[PDB]
């Protein structure tokens, strides 16, 4: 078995990974949108490893933080956007390949 | 020893956040990070 292309991880996570963690955090899509672009920025920047485990931790973190913004916070429907992202998961880690 | 083990006893939690605010602030100055995480935990368990 090989590694995975950056897009290849995109095609993974939009189907077989995000819904899974969404069922772990107990949320539904109605309130916790995740655009594709945020995922592409994520995988391109915050995790450079051939395996998918690290991206699995990131996307987890984002979801449950969204849950905290729901259950008590203001918004009835968190909407991750790339400009929004720095709030939720903080500052970029990697840059200088 | 086998019979002694509880099977399903579930201590009831407090689940109001307010009272958790107080009791976390009553006994430890600062260390705000851990407070934020555990508070987030109760906030989600109350949901799901």
UniProtKB/Swiss-Prot annotation, chain A:
Localization terms from the record: Mitochondrion matrix
Disulphide bridges, residue numbers: none
Expression (tissue specificity): Duodenum, heart, lung and liver, but not thymus.
Record remark: domains: The Lon N-terminal domains are crucial for the overall structure of the protein, maintaining it in a conformation allowing its proper functioning.
Its job: ATP-dependent serine protease that mediates the selective degradation of misfolded, unassembled or oxidatively damaged polypeptides as well as certain short-lived regulatory proteins in the mitochondrial matrix. Endogenous substrates include mitochondrial steroidogenic acute regulatory (StAR) protein, DELE1, helicase Twinkle (TWNK) and the large ribosomal subunit protein MRPL32/bL32m. MRPL32/bL32m is protected from degradation by LONP1 when it is bound to a nucleic acid (RNA), but TWNK is not. May also have a chaperone function in the assembly of inner membrane protein complexes.
Subunit structure and binding partners: Homohexamer. Organized in a ring with a central cavity. The ATP-binding and proteolytic domains (AP-domain) form a hexameric chamber, while the N-terminal domain is arranged as a trimer of dimers. DNA and RNA binding is stimulated by substrate and inhibited by ATP binding. Interacts with TWNK and mitochondrial DNA polymerase subunit POLG.
Family named by the database record: Belongs to the peptidase S16 family.
Linked pathology: CODAS syndrome: A rare syndrome characterized by the combination of cerebral, ocular, dental, auricular, and skeletal features. These include developmental delay, craniofacial anomalies, cataracts, ptosis, median nasal groove, delayed tooth eruption, hearing loss, short stature, delayed epiphyseal ossification, metaphyseal hip dysplasia, and vertebral coronal clefts.
Protein name per UniProt: Lon protease homolog, mitochondrial
Organism: Homo sapiens (Human)
Full protein segment contained here: 658 to 754 of 959
């Amino acid at each position: 078995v090989s590694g995975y292309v950056a897009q290849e991880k995109l095609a993974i996570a939009e189907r077989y990974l995000v819904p899974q963690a969404r069922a772990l955090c107990g949320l539904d899509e109605s309130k916790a949108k995740l655009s594709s672009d945020v995922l592409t920025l994520l995988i391109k920047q915050y995790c450079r490893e051939s395996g998918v485990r690290n991206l699995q931790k990131q996307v987890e973190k984002v979801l449950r933080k969204s849950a905290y913004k729901i259950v008590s916070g203001e918004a009835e429907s968190v909407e991750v956007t790339p400009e929004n992202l720095q709030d939720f998961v903080g500052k970029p880690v990697f840059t200088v390949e | 020893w086998l019979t002694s083990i509880p099977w399903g006893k579930y201590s009831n939690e407090n689940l109001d956040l307010a009272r958790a605010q107080a009791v976390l602030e009553e006994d430890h100055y600062g260390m705000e990070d851990v407070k934020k995480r555990i508070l987030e935990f109760i906030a989600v368990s109350q949901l799901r």
